[PDB]
Design a binder for this molecule. Structure first.
Ligand SMILES: Cc1cc2nc3c(=O)[nH]c(=O)nc-3n(C[C@H](O)[C@H](O)[C@H](O)COP(=O)(O)OP(=O)(O)OC[C@H]3O[C@@H](n4cnc5c(N)ncnc54)[C@H](O)[C@@H]3O)c2cc1C
Length: 295
């Protein structure tokens, strides 16, 4: 039922880039791009929460052909234009420091993708992943804990749930539960998809809450920079009360090691009612209701 591995690295899909638009507005840190690809000519179907591979051209430092890098899909099953013809990605350009051979090193596939022109041919594999799937239940609660490009599967959920054209195209999924996004980025220019996320909250104030953790603009109560863990600590009691519902699913996506502060915050909340969180979390993972994808 769930589409998986319709294309594989030995015979990938050759898709064309349609658009490559900036998501980091002026004044932000780094480059993150929304890249849309053409899927006509082949049979690549996908659903929300899945990933695709991109194989970059040329060779590595050892002369061997470059491997795929996995990217979370930014679009719903229908694509951004709700036509069943496209797929989108949300790609950060990886750039880093001076003690790693050279002066500034740029990541291979992400610099390729972030500078790619419309009309160019791309090797696409997949879709992969059954870890970040949205339930078919319209009455489910969805907590979304996103850091940076961790917004990317959250975009696919929130678009399916709340965009007018998506609701018209999906008669079996008219969402009426509650969704909460806690989004951690460094600046207000770095709030990826800000205007559309804020449009959804103004249109659906009882069904979507939007919380920001903006590190260069806000401080936590200890005087340090505001991160996603601090906003989870601020709302730990509320989030635990929602997690107790049998129909609540929680999604964690973003940088590796973000799980640690979220676990500590929900541990203090769960302990007030005599529950050890690390054990309750194991049962949620078993039930398929605690979904993690960090990198
Ligand atoms: C399931 C999954 C989903 C993902 N989704 C997305 C997504 O939606 N958007 C997105 O932008 N990315 C996503 N990523 C990460 C993405 O796959 C690639 O890892 C990333 O884009 C960098 O690939 P590259 O080819 O640009 O870098 P490479 O050229 O392979 O460079 C990466 C390598 O350089 C080193 N390196 C990286 N950062 C540093 C640092 N700060 N200091 C020192 N060394 C470092 C490491 O050796 C690392 O293996 C996802 C990863 C996974 C596993």
């Amino acid at each position: 039922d769930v589409p998986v591995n319709l294309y594989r690295p030995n015979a990938p899909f050759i898709g064309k880039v349609i658009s490559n638009e900036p998501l980091v507005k002026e004044g932000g840190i780094g480059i993150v791009q929304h890249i849309k690809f053409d899927l006509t000519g082949g049979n690549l179907k996908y659903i929300e929460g899945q990933s695709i591979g991109i194989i970059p051209p040329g060779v590595d430092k050892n002369g061997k052909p470059e491997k795929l890098r996995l990217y979370s899909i930014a679009s719903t099953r229908h694509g951004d234009d709700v036509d069943d013809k496209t797929i989108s990605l949300c790609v950060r350009q990886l750039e880093y420091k001076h003690p790693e051979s050279g002066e500034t090193v740029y990541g291979v596939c992400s610099t390729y993708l972030t500078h790619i022109e419309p009309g160019s041919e791309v090797k696409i594999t997949g879709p992969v992943g059954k870890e970040m799937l949205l339930p078919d239940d319209p009455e489910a609660n969805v907590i979304m804990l996103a850091g940076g490009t961790g917004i990317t599967p959250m975009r696919t959920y929130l678009w399916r749930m709340f965009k007018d054209a998506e609701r018209a195209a999906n008669p079996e999924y008219q969402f009426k539960g509650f969704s909460w996004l806690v989004f951690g980025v460094p600046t207000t220019p770095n709030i990826l998809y800000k205007e559309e996320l804020e449009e959804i909250q103004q249109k659906y104030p009882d069904n979507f809450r939007l919380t920001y953790a903006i590190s260069r603009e806000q401080k936590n109560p200890q005087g340090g920079r505001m991160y996603i863990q601090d906003r989870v600590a601020e709302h730990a009691d509320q989030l635990w009360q929602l997690i107790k519902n049998q129909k609540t699913h929680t999604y964690i996506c973003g940088p590796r090691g973000m799980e640690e502060g979220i676990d500590a915050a929900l541990s203090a909340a769960a302990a007030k009612e005599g529950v050890t969180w690390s054990d309750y979390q194991k049962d949620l993972k078993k039930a398929g209701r605690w979904h993690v994808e960090t990198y």
